[PDB]
Design an enzyme around this catalytic site. Structure first.
Site, PDB file in Angstrom:
ATOM      1  N   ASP A 183     -13.921  -1.380   0.193  1.00 41.33           N
ATOM      2  CA  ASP A 183     -14.019  -1.750  -1.320  1.00 41.33           C
ATOM      3  C   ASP A 183     -13.801  -0.396  -2.118  1.00 41.33           C
ATOM      4  O   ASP A 183     -14.248   0.750  -1.746  1.00 41.33           O
ATOM      5  CB  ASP A 183     -15.366  -2.258  -1.620  1.00 41.33           C
ATOM      6  CG  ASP A 183     -15.149  -3.203  -3.091  1.00 41.33           C
ATOM      7  OD1 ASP A 183     -14.208  -2.972  -3.582  1.00 41.33           O
ATOM      8  OD2 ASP A 183     -16.196  -4.059  -3.002  1.00 41.33           O
ATOM      9  N   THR A 213     -10.316  -4.036  -7.186  1.00 44.63           N
ATOM     10  CA  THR A 213     -11.023  -2.894  -7.052  1.00 44.63           C
ATOM     11  C   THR A 213      -9.927  -1.901  -6.499  1.00 44.63           C
ATOM     12  O   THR A 213      -9.906  -0.920  -7.248  1.00 44.63           O
ATOM     13  CB  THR A 213     -12.243  -2.763  -6.568  1.00 44.63           C
ATOM     14  OG1 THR A 213     -13.081  -3.184  -7.663  1.00 44.63           O
ATOM     15  CG2 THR A 213     -12.615  -1.647  -6.365  1.00 44.63           C
ATOM     16  N   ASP A 242     -18.160  -9.957  -2.691  1.00 46.92           N
ATOM     17  CA  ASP A 242     -16.766 -10.111  -3.592  1.00 46.92           C
ATOM     18  C   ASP A 242     -16.683 -11.433  -3.541  1.00 46.92           C
ATOM     19  O   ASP A 242     -15.793 -11.943  -4.379  1.00 46.92           O
ATOM     20  CB  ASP A 242     -15.737  -9.109  -2.847  1.00 46.92           C
ATOM     21  CG  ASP A 242     -16.184  -7.714  -2.947  1.00 46.92           C
ATOM     22  OD1 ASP A 242     -17.018  -7.375  -3.715  1.00 46.92           O
ATOM     23  OD2 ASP A 242     -15.269  -6.865  -2.504  1.00 46.92           O
TER      24      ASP A 242
HETATM   25  N1  LIG Z   1      -3.182 -14.410   3.363  1.00 46.17           N
HETATM   26  C1  LIG Z   1      -2.673 -13.520   2.548  1.00 46.17           C
HETATM   27  N2  LIG Z   1      -1.279 -13.167   2.523  1.00 46.17           N
HETATM   28  C2  LIG Z   1      -0.775 -12.173   1.907  1.00 46.17           C
HETATM   29  N3  LIG Z   1      -1.551 -11.243   1.171  1.00 46.17           N
HETATM   30  C3  LIG Z   1      -2.675 -11.422   0.925  1.00 46.17           C
HETATM   31  C4  LIG Z   1      -3.590 -12.497   1.742  1.00 46.17           C
HETATM   32  N4  LIG Z   1      -4.690 -12.351   1.414  1.00 46.17           N
HETATM   33  C5  LIG Z   1      -4.926 -11.465   0.492  1.00 46.17           C
HETATM   34  N5  LIG Z   1      -3.839 -10.653   0.293  1.00 46.17           N
HETATM   35  C6  LIG Z   1      -3.651  -9.515  -0.731  1.00 46.17           C
HETATM   36  O1  LIG Z   1      -4.496  -8.443  -0.338  1.00 46.17           O
HETATM   37  C7  LIG Z   1      -5.000  -7.887  -1.578  1.00 46.17           C
HETATM   38  C8  LIG Z   1      -6.460  -7.583  -1.327  1.00 46.17           C
HETATM   39  O2  LIG Z   1      -6.682  -6.872  -2.710  1.00 46.17           O
HETATM   40  P1  LIG Z   1      -8.113  -6.527  -2.716  1.00 46.17           P
HETATM   41  O3  LIG Z   1      -8.512  -5.191  -2.063  1.00 46.17           O
HETATM   42  O4  LIG Z   1      -9.175  -7.756  -2.653  1.00 46.17           O
HETATM   43  O5  LIG Z   1      -8.339  -6.110  -4.404  1.00 46.17           O
HETATM   44  P2  LIG Z   1      -9.942  -5.679  -5.113  1.00 46.17           P
HETATM   45  O6  LIG Z   1     -10.104  -4.439  -4.449  1.00 46.17           O
HETATM   46  O7  LIG Z   1      -9.375  -5.576  -6.537  1.00 46.17           O
HETATM   47  O8  LIG Z   1     -10.807  -6.718  -4.799  1.00 46.17           O
HETATM   48  C9  LIG Z   1      -4.556  -8.962  -2.588  1.00 46.17           C
HETATM   49  O9  LIG Z   1      -3.784  -8.114  -3.612  1.00 46.17           O
HETATM   50  C10 LIG Z   1      -3.768  -9.918  -2.015  1.00 46.17           C
HETATM   51  O10 LIG Z   1      -2.478  -9.892  -2.558  1.00 46.17           O
END
Ligand SMILES: Nc1ncnc2c1ncn2[C@@H]1O[C@H](COP(=O)(O)OP(=O)(O)O)[C@@H](O)[C@H]1O
Ligand SMILES: Nc1ncnc2c1ncn2[C@@H]1O[C@H](COP(=O)(O)OP(=O)(O)O)[C@@H](O)[C@H]1O
Ligand SMILES: Nc1ncnc2c1ncn2[C@@H]1O[C@H](COP(=O)(O)OP(=O)(O)O)[C@@H](O)[C@H]1O
Ligand SMILES: [Mg+2]
Lengths: 526, 537, 527, 74
Positions: A61, A94, A391
């Site tokens: 995170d 994040t 989260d």
């Molecule tokens: N099944 C999937 N296929 C493609 N991309 C994905 C999938 N699941 C999640 N993602 C991508 O992974 C990223 C995870 O971001 P994340 O680190 O959770 O953001 P934050 O830190 O704001 O929570 C997202 O932007 C999303 O586009």
């Protein structure tokens, strides 16, 4: 060799000035963005940060990694605070807020080295951000058939993508079903203190469970707890805030006695004070006793003879969850005990999950709370599982009050580059080099979905810019197959306010880095 | 487990980001000394010596560097002096921006061999486009091409006056040393111009000595310091007493033969000095040493004798005055002949006053009519700057007279190559088109630096600069906008054909060839191993 | 060998230095105050740049206001502290124009160095500056063109407050003007004293500045310790005593002499606390806010009679709550409250920005107190908007004291530069050189506005005197784009703080005069 | 470069960054396997009925001969 006065400037302070100051701030944000760069996407790795005390914390995170780096740079602290506010407002924005704000500075980094007074860049960043947060609201899909099975399926798809990029690979269908069922049992306040996440060492991720009631950790008891068996089919819970000890003293009482006939009457009265409190708990059906204040050896053996269970030194966070589970009320004075203040459950046992004992409550239908017991193989493994659970909870918490969702992956971040490049070709001036640079900066979210696993990210962006300019607006990056895919049809969903607060916090952070021209540091550090 | 080397190993994108910051650490220094609005710097040593200069070679040679990618750009500036001579701030900024834009490509998971092969397709096309879009050779403009190309080099230095005082002295110096060669090669050796420095009057009193200006004194204060219709005798042997060699010793067995050997060491010495002086020779130049006994024969006969001159200065005098550099006796077992018909000639050898020093001047030399420039400045810091600025100005007119081809300066070449290479990358570009497209943006940093140092508009003046060059390539209506440059005193695009802003062709051809080749070597440091210093064992 | 120069007449110090004369004392005080004028010259104006200033406590302050920068810089030059305390007096008097002091007094001392090195001593530059300062106070009532008198509502003050906002928040000049209009007008005392302490800023970390609003009431950062958080009647009984019972003062000792007094003491104390909570429940109270701690027996009957409890650990926030709901803090234990009860509209709780807050929101009776709830992405951004909020409240107090305004943005300083030059040419004395230098100090104030906008200040300052031909008196600076072609200030609406201009000229003149009076400096050993 | 900028300014991001250790590379995964294989090669000889015991010495000098995998690694 130049400054040699008789009286110095302030004490000994050094301060940079002008264009070498601004590139020093932009390049500093690029270094701190590498600590959240490899944590994006489902093929993104985690990171392990060890402090000076030797405590290891492995996480992915952005609000957890950036708080453990101990960054003392003034401009690089701006990217840490927007990762803290994304966890405080959304909960799952994040790593994307920190990395996108660093690209807003790197796309104008060849522009700030050659003129371009930064008031034009702040005006262009605020113009592109307001058009970006408006096209999200005009394209976020919604339904008009809520309070059905279709609304629960919308909450499960937003929790599976929130549980993505975590330490969960095949447990997406098991954990995210419990996250949606956790917030639907809560009341209309959505308080995070009304759900207990307790870590029990030992067991796989499939051994975890969502308790409909509550469960505490069975803290330090006294002689008499190997008795009082844990088989109750319809018990009543007496939540107390009183001491059940013989030594309950008000710390100012001096019992001056004159004779030996009245001296024995005081000692008999001290037992009669404690035994009168135990008779108030008795003759009311309250077989289970819970109190945050300790219980001595006298009241422990009294409940063992009357076939009653007790539990002392309960934490106050657990008794607040216990009150909303059984539907009773915590009574400090035992004189006002009645049927309206006692609880009611169906199954109350003391199990042996993970070696340690846990007194769990189950069976109450009027349960306004829940408890999610985590089972893992390490203490740092369950802390990441708890951090991954928060989260997914905070995504589905905001999704109830605002059910407008968008496509996941780099589908929204690519189509916002389409609407901004078309807007930049319709305005004259120096904003064509800034609105278009803001659109090219949004294309790193599909880049980090591919750069973490290869995927030939140069050729996959030519397919994304061609698909969004021709057909649909929800085409993103597929993770299993190395091709483009419709993320709306592949059920890769996320709420719309996740990307709205991401674009707002990254733009206000990027406008703050380009607006500071001097950095004065005083040498007094004691 | 890992490598057991005793040094340090860093792989990945760590060194790939460190080499760009090592090249940008050098480019951000010399970015403030480019163009007519460029400003000089100060180079202070630990011993207290101060060097005020703005040339890209003098700064980076005295500056200490440690990084291996930093020594490539510092040695790149040293090669520009020998090959061209003024092209030695512009190469360092281009070669560092070639690494800055290629770093953005390798962060997009593009392989660096495609960037190396993409840069070679853009470098060879830039030389092809600049050789087919020149204006005219040195026949139409005549002498106006040599003066306007000289003033472009002086605009970045201390001699950039509004007049044509320093411009006319450089053209009259190169045109007076025209040395022909075999197969029709009119060579112009600019190293034969003796550039002297003296803290005296202002810069408008810089004398153009038609001849040679020897930096030496007469020695004995009994010789005539001005000889009209002089005959120079150039020779290289020490005019001292006859000392025997190591293999020869004087072992005398008779005391009567003692004094005849002692007088023989001066009689053989004075026998050479009487046969080189009876042939009409008045000026004698010697790279060895003339002791106090031999100085009497020049005071008595009324001749000038200059001792301890440089060997590089004697060759410039004997070739320009028709003298023969003689080291010893010669001509087929002759005792003392000296070949008196091979003496030099000079109109006047006069020692003038050069503000509390002695300086010997030779006027027109009667054989080749060479030239030497005596500079005049306020202090010694200006005289070291005036010498470096004049030497870079002599190298500009040398390449124009040799290679009769000039290109418009002031960012006119970099504006035309920024748009032709974008159209070149679209035709035959499949996977290396991104490297050719970033080659055009790296070339735009030369007109971008002219707008920063002039404190003018940056993103609007260069945008107006390439607006004229785009219409000169896509609208074939004879617009003649290929010579559009920058007016840094006004802040508007001007025509460099009528304004007189001319640069040689090989000041940009060799600049684009050296900066592209240097950018390839720094692009291949994906792995770097640094060992520990082996000093005390 | 090498000799040395010893002490001469009064070298009696043990490590302290001494300064005497014009070159060692007067000229060095000018060059030290010139460095502070060139420091804050970049942060002056609407196009000013921020400054990340780190104090000795190793925390970050990023702002463009010159008042908060000098409080963090540990200045040690003695004459440089005189221009800092003169700027601190501008914040205490009107709250705006603290940077105007550093530019004007920094240019007054700089042009005084050109007079001491060419001419008159400090006995005539000081007397020359005082004549032009008295004449500068006669042009400022003549430059007043508009007034903040007609339609004192949220419509007119939304445009009259934009000048104090756009000087530090250029892009947010429209949102912060409406938030300061719904807060300052709502706390109007009906033609009385406008208190600036009745506006609080609740920094809530979260989304951007578009989600900020103003709530009619107070927002705290504490909890309830109960389950009665939904209150709609809102009859608040405010107390200052700790809500745990009535204890004695000297020692305190329970004296038990028999077995009946020991058993009845624990039950008698619970019945005594039961009678006090039900005495306030029969009066209709719903919210009981105390200042001290609260025992477990008080929390037992608070949830039984369904009344809400609020803990306020700060004693200053308790007095602001009494002016919010209209109650009185009672120092004794819980009485039957006759008429000192509070009356709000809705007291609830909500977790905004992962922060559980307590909101005393007024719905119908809106005007008693105001609290601007600011939102931001960073904690450093919300401190900078709070400085811009406090500059909007302090400007509203200036318009209460004096409703006159002068056209800013460079239009006032040029007309002050023209009239003082007219008085300098009509003075047949030797002090006319300081009067002409006093008008050139007003010329450098729109010079700092053009240098921060990337415009050449030579062509900017030439067009200002060309359009000020004795009858315009209003054209300022148009910093919206390059090649300005400057426009009128009354049509744009750039006019603010006539009383701020009246005090900033007077304070900066007295600061520059006090530096020129210093001829001999005797400092001590710093320790 | 590290701890310095291209304009000559000191480049300090985190506190005490000169005494830090950071490995991303390709050997960061290799360092985790070689550290875990040496623990597995130690516990390989104490598996089965022919597994030889291990002698553990505490910080106070107490010696405990253990064979179970829980008390050995603890
Ligand atoms: N099944 C999937 N296929 C493609 N991309 C994905 C999938 N699941 C999640 N993602 C991508 O992974 C990223 C995870 O971001 P994340 O680190 O959770 O953001 P934050 O830190 O704001 O929570 C997202 O932007 C999303 O586009
Ligand atoms: N009158 C002028 N107008 C516009 N540009 C000029 C003018 N004179 C010189 N320049 C520019 O200034 C630059 C100076 O480069 P310079 O530092 O001399 O290169 P080098 O270091 O190789 O000698 C040239 O590239 C030229 O384009
Ligand atoms: N819209 C505008 N156009 C031109 N100038 C402006 C505008 N808004 C503010 N200014 C100028 O910016 C300056 C800001 O001064 P400021 O730093 O607020 O003074 P102080 O520090 O005393 O508060 C004012 O003098 C004003 O002339
Ligand atoms: Mg202001």
């Amino acid at each position: 060799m130049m400054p040699t006065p008789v009286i110095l400037l302030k004490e000994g302070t050094d301060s940079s000035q002008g264009i070498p100051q601004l590139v020093s701030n932009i390049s500093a944000c690029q270094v701190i963005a590498e600590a959240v760069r490899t944590t994006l996407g489902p093929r993104g790795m985690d990171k392990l940060i060890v402090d000076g005390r030797g405590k290891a914390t492995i996480s992915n995170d952005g609000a957890t990694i950036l708080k453990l780096l101990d960054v003392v740079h003034p401009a690089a602290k701006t990217l840490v605070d927007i990762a803290k506010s994304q966890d405080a407002e959304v909960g799952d924005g994040t790593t994307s807020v920190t990395l996108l704000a660093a690209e807003f500075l790197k796309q104008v980094k060849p522009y700030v080295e050659e003129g371009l007074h930064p008031q034009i860049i702040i005006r262009a960043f605020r113009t592109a951000t307001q058009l970006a947060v408006n096209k999200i609201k005009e394209i976020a899909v919604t339904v008009k058939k809520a309070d059905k099975v279709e609304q629960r399926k919308l909450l499960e798809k937003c929790a599976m993508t929130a549980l993505s990029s975590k330490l969960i690979s095949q447990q997406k269908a098991f954990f995210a079903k419990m996250v949606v069922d956790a917030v639907m049992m809560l009341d209309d306040l959505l308080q995070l203190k009304m759900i207990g996440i307790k870590k029990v060492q030992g067991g796989a991720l499939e051994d975890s469970q969502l308790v409909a009631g509550v469960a505490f950790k069975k803290t330090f008891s006294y002689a008499g707890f190997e008795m009082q068996p844990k088989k109750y089919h319809n018990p009543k819970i007496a939540l107390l805030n009183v001491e059940l000890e013989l030594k309950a003293e008000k710390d100012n009482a001096e019992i001056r006695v004159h004779t030996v006939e009245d001296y024995q009457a005081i000692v008999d009265a001290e037992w009669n004070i404690l035994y009168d409190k135990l008779e108030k708990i008795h003759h009311s059906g309250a077989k289970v006793v819970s109190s945050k204040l300790p219980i001595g050896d006298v009241a422990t053996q009294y409940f063992a003879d009357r076939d009653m269970f007790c539990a002392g030194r309960v934490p106050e966070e657990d008794l607040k969850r216990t009150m909303m589970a059984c539907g009773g009320s915590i009574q400090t004075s035992v004189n006002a005990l009645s049927a309206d203040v006692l609880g009611r459950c169906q199954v109350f046992e003391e199990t042996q999950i993970g070696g340690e004992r846990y007194n769990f409550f189950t069976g109450c239908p009027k349960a306004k709370t829940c408890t999610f017991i985590l089972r893992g193989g390490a203490e740092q493994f369950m802390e990441e599982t708890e951090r991954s659970l928060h989260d997914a909870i905070m995504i589905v918490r905001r999704a109830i009050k605002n059910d407008s969702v968008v496509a996941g992956g780099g589908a929204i971040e690519m189509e916002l580059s389409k609407y901004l490049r078309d807007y930049s070709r319709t305005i004259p001036g120096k904003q064509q080099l800034l609105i278009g640079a803001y659109a090219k900066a949004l294309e790193i979210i599909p880049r980090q979905l591919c750069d973490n696993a290869g995927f030939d990210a140069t050729n996959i962006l030519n397919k994304l810019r061609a698909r969004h300019a021709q057909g649909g607006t929800w085409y993103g990056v597929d993770i299993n197959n190395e091709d483009i895919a419709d993320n709306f049809e592949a059920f890769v969903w996320e709420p719309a306010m996740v990307r709205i607060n991401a674009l707002t916090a990254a733009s206000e952070a990027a406008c703050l880095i380009v607006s500071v021209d001097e950095t004065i540091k005083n040498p007094r550090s004691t | 487990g890992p490598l057991s080397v005793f040094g340090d190993r860093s792989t990945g994108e760590t060194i790939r980001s460190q080499n760009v910051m090592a090249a940008a650490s050098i480019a951000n220094i010399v970015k403030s000394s480019l163009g007519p609005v460029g400003l000089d710097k100060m180079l202070v040593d630990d011993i207290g010596d101060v060097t005020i200069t703005n040339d890209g070679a003098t700064i980076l040679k005295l500056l200490e560097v440690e990084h291996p990618a930093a020594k490539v750009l510092c040695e790149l500036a040293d090669l520009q002096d020998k090959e061209v001579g003024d092209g030695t701030t512009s190469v360092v900024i281009i070669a560092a921006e070639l690494l800055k834009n290629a770093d953005e490509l390798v962060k997009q998971k593009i392989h660096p061999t495609s960037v190396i092969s993409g840069y070679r397709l853009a470098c060879k096309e830039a030389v092809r486009y600049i050789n087919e879009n020149l204006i005219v050779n040195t026949d139409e403009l005549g002498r106006d091409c040599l003066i306007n190309a000289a003033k472009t080099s002086m605009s970045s230095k201390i001699i950039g006056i509004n007049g044509d005082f320093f411009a006319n002295m450089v053209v009259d110096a190169v045109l007076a040393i025209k040395y022909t060669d075999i197969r029709g090669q009119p060579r112009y050796p600019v190293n034969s111009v003796n550039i002297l420095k003296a803290h005296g009057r202002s810069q408008m009193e810089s004398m153009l000595i038609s001849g040679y200006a020897l930096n030496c004194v007469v020695g004995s204060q009994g010789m005539p310091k001005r000889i009209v219709n002089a005959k120079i005798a150039c020779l290289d042997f020490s005019l001292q007493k006859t000392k025997m060699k190591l293999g020869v010793q004087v072992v005398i067995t008779d005391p009567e033969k003692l004094d005849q050997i002692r007088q023989r060491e001066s009689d053989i010495t004075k026998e050479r000095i009487q046969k080189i002086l009876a042939t009409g020779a008045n000026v004698i130049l010697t790279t060895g040493g003339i002791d106090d006994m031999c100085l009497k024969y020049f005071v008595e006969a009324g001749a000038m004798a200059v001792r301890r001159v440089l060997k590089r200065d004697l060759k410039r005098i004997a070739k320009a005055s028709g003298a023969t550099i003689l080291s010893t006796l010669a001509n087929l077992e002759g005792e003392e002949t000296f070949e008196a018909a091979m003496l030099g000639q000079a109109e006047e050898v006069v020692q003038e006053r050069i503000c509390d020093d002695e300086l010997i001047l030779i006027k027109n030399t009667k054989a080749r009519t060479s030239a030497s420039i005596i500079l005049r400045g306020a202090n010694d810091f200006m005289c070291d700057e005036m010498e470096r600025s004049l030497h870079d100005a002599l190298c500009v007119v040398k390449r124009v007279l040799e290679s009769k081809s000039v290109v418009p300066g002031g960012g006119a070449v970099e504006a035309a190559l920024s748009i032709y290479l974008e159209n070149y990358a679209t035709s035959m570009g499949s996977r290396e088109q991104l490297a050719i497209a970033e080659f055009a943006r790296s070339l735009l940093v030369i007109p971008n630096t002219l707008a920063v140092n002039a404190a003018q508009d940056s993103t609007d003046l260069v945008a107006k600069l390439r607006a004229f060059h785009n219409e000169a390539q896509v609208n074939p209506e004879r617009k003649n906008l290929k010579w559009i440059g920058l007016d840094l005193s006004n802040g508007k695009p001007r025509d460099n054909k009528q304004a007189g802003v001319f640069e040689p062709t090989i000041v940009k051809v060799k600049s684009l060839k050296f900066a592209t080749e240097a950018a390839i070597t720094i692009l291949r440091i994906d792995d770097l191993i640094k060992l520990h210093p082996e000093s005390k064992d | 060998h090498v000799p040395k120069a010893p002490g001469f007449a009064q070298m009696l110090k043990e490590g302290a230095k001494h300064f005497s004369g014009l070159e060692e004392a007067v000229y060095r005080n000018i060059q030290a105050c010139k460095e502070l004028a060139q420091t804050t010259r970049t942060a002056y104006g609407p196009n000013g740049m921020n400054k990340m200033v780190i104090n000795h406590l190793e925390k970050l302050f990023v702002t463009n206001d010159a008042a908060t920068i000098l409080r963090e810089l540990e200045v040690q030059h003695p004459a440089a502290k005189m221009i800092v305390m003169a700027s601190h007096m501008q914040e205490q008097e009107v709250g705006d124009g603290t940077n105007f002091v550093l530019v004007f007094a920094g240019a007054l001392l700089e042009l005084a160095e050109e007079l001491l090195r060419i001419g008159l001593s400090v006995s005539e530059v000081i007397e020359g500056y005082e004549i032009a300062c008295r004449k500068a106070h006669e042009i400022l009532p003549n430059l007043v063109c508009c007034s903040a008198k007609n339609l004192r509502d949220i419509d007119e003050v939304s445009s009259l407050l934009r000048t104090s906002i756009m000087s530090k928040q250029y892009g947010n000049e429209v949102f912060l003007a409406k938030l300061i209009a719904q807060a300052c007008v709502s706390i109007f005392p009906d033609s009385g004293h406008f208190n600036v302490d009745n506006i609080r800023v609740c920094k809530i970390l979260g989304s951007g500045i578009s989600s900020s609003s103003v709530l009619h009431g107070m927002v705290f950062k504490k909890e309830t310790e109960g389950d009665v958080t939904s209150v709609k009647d809102a009859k608040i009984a405010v107390y200052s005593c700790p809500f745990d019972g009535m204890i004695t003062e000297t020692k305190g000792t329970v004296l038990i002499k028999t077995a009946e007094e020991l058993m009845n003491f624990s039950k008698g104390e619970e019945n005594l606390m039961d009678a006090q909570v039900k005495a306030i429940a029969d009066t209709g109270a719903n919210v009981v806010v105390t200042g001290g701690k609260v025992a477990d027996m008080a929390l037992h009957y608070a949830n039984k009679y369904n009344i809400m409890l609020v803990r306020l650990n700060s004693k200053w926030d308790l007095r602001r709550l009494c002016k919010t709901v209209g109650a009185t803090a009672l120092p004794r234990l819980t009485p039957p409250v006759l008429e000192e009860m509070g009356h709000c509209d809705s007291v609830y709780l909500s977790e905004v920005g992962d922060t559980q807050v307590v909101v005393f929101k007024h719905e119908k009776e809106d005007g008693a107190i105001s609290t601007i709830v600011l939102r931001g992405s960073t904690d450093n951004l919300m401190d900078d908007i709070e400085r811009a909020v406090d500059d909007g409240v302090n400007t509203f107090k200036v318009l209460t004291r004096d409703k006159r305004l002068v056209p800013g943005g460079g239009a006032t300083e040029i007309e002050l530069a023209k009239q003082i030059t007219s008085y300098g040419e009509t003075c047949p004395g030797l002090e006319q050189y300081a009067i002409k230098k006093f008008a050139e100090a007003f010329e450098a104030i729109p010079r700092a506005l053009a240098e921060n906008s990337g415009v050449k200040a030579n062509e900017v300052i030439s067009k200002l005197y060309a359009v000020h031909q004795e009858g315009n008196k209003n054209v300022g600076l148009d910093i919206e784009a390059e090649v300005p072609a400057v426009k009128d200030m009354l049509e744009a609406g750039i006019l603010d703080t006539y009383l701020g201009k009246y005090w900033a000229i007077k304070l900066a003149t007295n600061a520059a005069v006090t530096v020129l009076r210093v001829d001999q400096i005797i400092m001590a050993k710093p320790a | 470069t590290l701890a310095f900028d291209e304009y000559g300014r000191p480049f300090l991001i985190i506190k005490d960054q000169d005494r830090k250790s950071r490995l991303m590379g390709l050997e960061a995964l290799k360092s985790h396997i070689m550290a875990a294989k040496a623990v597995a090669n130690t516990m390989r000889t104490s598996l089965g009925p022919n597994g030889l015991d291990k002698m553990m010495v505490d910080k106070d000098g107490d010696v405990t001969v253990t064979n179970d995998g829980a008390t050995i690694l603890s």
